[PDB]
Amino acid sequence: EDAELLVTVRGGRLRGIRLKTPGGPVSAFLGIPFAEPPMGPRRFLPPEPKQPWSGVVDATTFQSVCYQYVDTLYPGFEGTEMWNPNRELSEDCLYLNVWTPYPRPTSPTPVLVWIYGGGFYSGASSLDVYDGRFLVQAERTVLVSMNYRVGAFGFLALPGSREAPGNVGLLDQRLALQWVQENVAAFGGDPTSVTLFGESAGAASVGMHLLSPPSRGLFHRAVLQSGAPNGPWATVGMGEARRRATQLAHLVGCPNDTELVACLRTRPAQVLVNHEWHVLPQESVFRFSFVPVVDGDFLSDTPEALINAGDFHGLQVLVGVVKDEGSYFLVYGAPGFSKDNESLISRAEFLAGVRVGVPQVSDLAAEAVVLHYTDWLHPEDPARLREALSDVVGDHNVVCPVAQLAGRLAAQGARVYAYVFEHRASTLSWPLWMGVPHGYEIEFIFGIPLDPSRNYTAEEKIFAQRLMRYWANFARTGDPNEPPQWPPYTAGAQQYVSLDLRPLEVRRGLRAQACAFWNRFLPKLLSA
Amino acid sequence: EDAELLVTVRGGRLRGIRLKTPGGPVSAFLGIPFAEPPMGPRRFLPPEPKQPWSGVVDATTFQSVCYQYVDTLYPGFEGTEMWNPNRELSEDCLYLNVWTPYPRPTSPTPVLVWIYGGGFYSGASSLDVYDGRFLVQAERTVLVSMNYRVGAFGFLALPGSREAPGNVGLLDQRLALQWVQENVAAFGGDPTSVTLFGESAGAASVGMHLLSPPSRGLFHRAVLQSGAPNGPWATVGMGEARRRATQLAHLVGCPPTGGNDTELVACLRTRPAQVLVNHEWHVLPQESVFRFSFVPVVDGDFLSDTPEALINAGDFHGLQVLVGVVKDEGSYFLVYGAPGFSKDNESLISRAEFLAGVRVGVPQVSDLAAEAVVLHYTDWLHPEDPARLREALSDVVGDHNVVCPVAQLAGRLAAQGARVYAYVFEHRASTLSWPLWMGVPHGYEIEFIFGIPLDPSRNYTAEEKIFAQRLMRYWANFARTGDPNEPAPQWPPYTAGAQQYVSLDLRPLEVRRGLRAQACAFWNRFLPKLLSA
């Protein structure tokens, strides 16, 4: 047999598989159990470490995807199917994967740990677009990705109860991070140089590990792509978490917190998934029902509170956004929008869409948004309205939260690097008016264009190797630059670079004007 | 005697003078009494019409300036002395002036009626910059200007009182308009073609005559320069007027606070005029700029509702309006209180001084409202640039008080039937005394409207003289026909949608869009809703 493909971790022995890349072989260990299956009486509970096993665990294929909603809006359309589960669904789903150079490294190797996004209601470490084979071959890293529970299974909260305490999906991730500390050395990885990176809800979870002391000792650097823990969508208060969990029980026919969760545990997993979206208070976009809860435990305060109160010297983070963060979300509830036309909306549809994009704010607050995003010399132009509503959803949910994190961390000791990803892939199936949509920098950071089975151009391949080197340079040293320089982001200069096929261009300000509204003014308005 | 210099009006006979102008003789009748002198027991009362006289009244020089405060900030400096009284102060001051071509016209000719500004606390029709001889000579119109009471004398109000009903300074204006209607035909003017035009507080007053029905029958067209009735400074509520009137009285001895209105006004009437003037600004509640102690009050009489509400409910079909502003409306006001500002340095303020100036520029608003102002006028990529902050604060003062009020008026009047024309005056005069950073400051289009550069004793360039002749022709064309275009790039009507206006400077007309539409949307559409919640 191949001795490179057999590893002993603390729980027992594993057998991996060898994989081809256009640059050479890679060792992969897929489907490693890191937790006891959170099933039956273990539903909603914090994860238990996987008990040791005898024999050899088969680690040659991906394990199951945690139970989650499956999108049906454009069935068969690649733009939507690429995020849908590609393995069967199961509550037995707490498995992580390790990619490693072939032969396995002899010296400690920097570790990248990937946390997928999916609004905390979906996602899987087994998606084609999170394939780690290209990064570990091109950049000689160890890549780890784990599955964590999503939707109600990971984030249903009855705050105060021990039978449904909340944030257990976050605890799944932390447990995998503890698994890396105890076991990644057996694969050649260096546990003293772990770099977290994630996108969207994955980027939010990275930030929440930055702000939870128990997790902070498990990694050393962080990359947050198109997400932040301080969004309007990434956390929920205790009282709202309790209301949503209670309405879920009523929707599925149940029923004392003990009697409520006991009844929920009798229900097939598909039943809860089928109802999770209907506990949201308002019709909205970019809002998810079961997200992390601020109960003083995992997060002792709100992310913004912890961000402003934090000393962040000794931290290096890489943060960024795509050029058009909002367009993707508009075809999922904004009236007048669809990927199959130009979506040139009326002002009425624009006004309606602002309530959908900024749900559960006062009429005055909504009118303040309309004032900022209206061009009062062209108040009714359909094309400008389309691009303005996408600016609303994108700035409110991604750009401005990212900008606040970058500015606060920078001014409070951290070295920050910011990017805007401005390249529209030649393969992109979405219409042209959506620009560079949310999520579509991931395929380049993982080096998917190097797969010769796809039709990326030669320059997109070179571009992918540029990005993989930036990311891996940051993992290795905390500086993405090769030793046109990428300057650190600071609260004053607000400098970032644009990532596309032409060389690095340094620009100033992550929509400083629009984000002054969201980050500085709008909070004060909601207080009064 | 010269027969052209003798006219009979209703009151009796007048004798005027023949003025020499650069272009030829003009007959002037200066100092025509139109009301009984508002003295002693007539202080604070509405004007009563001038009773008939026997013999010939010599209307041969400007009469006195209505008692008012005199600016002392930059003594001897032309930029401020030009606005100060150039006649003796007196409460006996209700006189008007008539300029007419020499010889008098035999068929009726259109009439322009000027209403000076001065924040309702100052101003006079006698100021050199309001000389009507050039307009009359160059464009063949009858020009009328009047004095009206200012300060407490014009606008101290104890609403509901008989002894001080308020708005008497506006009634001074209305009485003069009534005078024009009955008497201008004797000077050759056409009482069926009367165009009101004023600047700043004068522009605000012109608008209040548009919105008060009893005045609306006395003119046909209006020109509003750098002012509007709906500004945050041109009116005041009944209770605040009462509060200021009562504290003014308290500060000067009356009564020996509040109580009975007749007894209180009777006591105020025994106080010398200068004593009242010397305490007028002590009643303003906060440190501010572009705010004035005694202004028109909204008491349901002269104005049945606020100018905003009246503008919204108005049917303005059959009305032609000419409105506009200067390029840098707010700079002039910053050297009168804004921390760090001076006409003698470049006033490159700090950010702290910017934030402090915002409170001075927008007084008596919630902290939230002040943060909203700071949000829209900060450049969050250059938040502490001294020059950018200096221009931003001037934009705050200008947009808040002038530009956006004018814009809201222009847009609502256009949408509700009126043909509106709008300008931005963008020429900095070669003779200007203010520093360069102030740009084209508030009030400095007037001299070109009145054709002052044609005075040979002045030192304007030749091109500025042609510019003066162009603007006078615009204003006179609008007065005659309601259209400033000569019967040459055309001047399009302002509409709420297209929002077109023209720029006035030494270059030919340039059409533009939007009177600071982004800024004004904040002032006219958002902030009103913030202040209610």
Ligand SMILES: *[C@@H]1O[C@H](CO[C@@H]2O[C@@H](C)[C@@H](O)[C@@H](O)[C@@H]2O)[C@@H](O[C@@H]2O[C@H](CO)[C@@H](O)[C@H](O)[C@H]2NC(C)=O)[C@H](O)[C@H]1NC(C)=O
């Ligand atoms: C563009 O299309 C959208 C969405 O319409 C859908 O996609 C179209 C391509 C076509 O397949 C339709 O049959 C689909 O319904 C339009 O937005 C909708 O417009 C209809 C009225 O025609 C309205 O009843 C819906 O409420 C709108 N969408 C939603 C979800 O409310 C939009 O009007 C189209 N704009 C164009 C054609 O310019």
Ligand SMILES: *[C@@H]1O[C@H](CO[C@@H]2O[C@@H](C)[C@@H](O)[C@@H](O)[C@@H]2O)[C@@H](O[C@@H]2O[C@H](CO)[C@@H](O)[C@H](O)[C@H]2NC(C)=O)[C@H](O)[C@H]1NC(C)=O
């Ligand atoms: C408020 O006071 C006025 C004026 O009072 C007069 O003058 C005072 C100094 C003192 O001499 C009083 O006695 C005087 O009456 C009142 O107006 C007068 O009211 C009386 C009684 O009705 C009447 O005979 C007088 O003619 C009025 N004089 C006027 C109108 O000038 C007024 O009634 C008082 N109102 C109150 C107390 O609310």
Ligand SMILES: *[C@@H]1O[C@H](CO[C@@H]2O[C@@H](C)[C@@H](O)[C@@H](O)[C@@H]2O)[C@@H](O[C@@H]2O[C@H](CO)[C@@H](O)[C@H](O)[C@H]2NC(C)=O)[C@H](O)[C@H]1NC(C)=O
């Ligand atoms: C610019 O000048 C202003 C006003 O100062 C006046 O003008 C000067 C040229 C000089 O003639 C002074 O004597 C005048 O008083 C300055 O603002 C003042 O600054 C002083 C000193 O710091 C302070 O005590 C006053 O309170 C300030 N007054 C106001 C109204 O703010 C300003 O600091 C100068 N800025 C410069 C020079 O850049």
Ligand SMILES: NC(=O)c1cc[n+](COC[n+]2ccccc2/C=N/O)cc1
């Ligand atoms: N009656 C008063 O005491 C008084 C005091 C101050 N002001 C305002 O004057 C300051 N000011 C402020 C801005 C522009 C001009 C001027 C001066 N004009 O004469 C008016 C009345």
Ligand SMILES: NC(=O)c1cc[n+](COC[n+]2ccccc2/C=N\O)cc1
């Ligand atoms: N549990 C939920 O809140 C939820 C949210 C969204 N969706 C799917 O519909 C929204 N949607 C559909 C397609 C793509 C994106 C999105 C929204 N956010 O990502 C299902 C369940």
Ligand SMILES: *[C@@H]1O[C@H](CO)[C@@H](O)[C@H](O)[C@H]1NC(C)=O
């Ligand atoms: C691009 O790739 C897809 C999937 O491999 C393939 O089906 C398609 O044929 C390629 N391009 C074209 C135009 O053939």
Ligand SMILES: *[P@](C)(=O)/N=C(\C)N(CC)CC
């Ligand atoms: P974020 C809102 O967590 N990301 C989502 C919803 N993605 C799917 C389009 C990217 C993984």
Ligand SMILES: *[P@](C)(=O)/N=C(\C)N(CC)CC
């Ligand atoms: P407005 C505020 O009435 N105008 C003023 C105070 N001026 C003085 C320069 C212009 C006449």
